[PDB]
């Protein structure tokens, strides 16, 4: 409910569209598993789509750690300092592509 959560005013971060538009994403930190069925969609994402994603919008630096983990994650870092960590645990290739595109 709105009385129980904080609230902010609608704002741009540094007046984006006024001069030049800048990609507000800095990083994507991927942590996928070599063995382990929970990271199968992310394994196929690193196979096929992260190369075209990295070529698509070059402002973003992408890291793939390839670490033993029971739940794979993606950490999205923005220009103003915020850090958004999302779990890609047992998802499709299309769901992970949708998630990294929305990030």
């Amino acid at each position: 409910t709105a009385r129980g959560t904080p609230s902010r005013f609608l704002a741009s971060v540094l007046h984006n569209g006024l001069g030049r538009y800048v990609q507000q994403l800095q990083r994507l930190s991927f942590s996928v598993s070599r063995d382990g069925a929970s990271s199968r969609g992310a394994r196929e994402f690193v196979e096929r789509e992260v190369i075209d994603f990295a070529r698509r919008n070059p402002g973003v630096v992408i890291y793939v750690n390839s670490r033993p983990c029971c739940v794979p994650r993606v950490v999205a870092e923005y220009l103003n300092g915020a850090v958004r960590e999302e779990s890609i645990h047992c998802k499709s290739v299309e769901e992970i592509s949708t998630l990294v595109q929305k990030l």
Binding site: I51, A54, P58, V61, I62, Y63, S66
Partner: protein, 110 residues
């Protein structure tokens, strides 16, 4: 006493004289003529099939697996198998050897 001959890579690259080598070893194994279609004779005789595939596996290092041992009825089939080639690099070695962009780094904690 006989301990540890080293492991062999599973990678394979077919040579350029494959046709001459296959016709040479079919002439050597069968002891027959060319007449019109050397690559259409059958391998139902299991001694002749064993001698051919054992000689090829001794020479070229790749050996036909059992699921493909089933499917070889002509010498055209073993010729189509020895133009397949495969590769035994790891996933990470194959991934870093792709055309990676300047903004994508990968690490391996394994």
């Amino acid at each position: 006493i006989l301990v540890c001959p080293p492991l062999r890579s599973r990678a394979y690259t077919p040579p350029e004289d494959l046709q001459s080598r296959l016709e040479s070893y079919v002439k050597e194994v069968f002891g027959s003529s060319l007449p019109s279609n050397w690559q259409d004779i059958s391998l139902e005789d299991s001694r002749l099939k064993f001698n051919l595939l054992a000689h090829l596996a001794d020479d070229l290092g790749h050996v036909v697996p059992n699921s493909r041992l089933h499917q070889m009825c002509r010498v055209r089939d073993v010729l189509d198998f020895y133009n397949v080639p495969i590769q035994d690099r790891s996933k990470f070695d194959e991934l870093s050897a792709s055309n990676l962009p300047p903004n994508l780094k990968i690490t391996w904690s394994y």
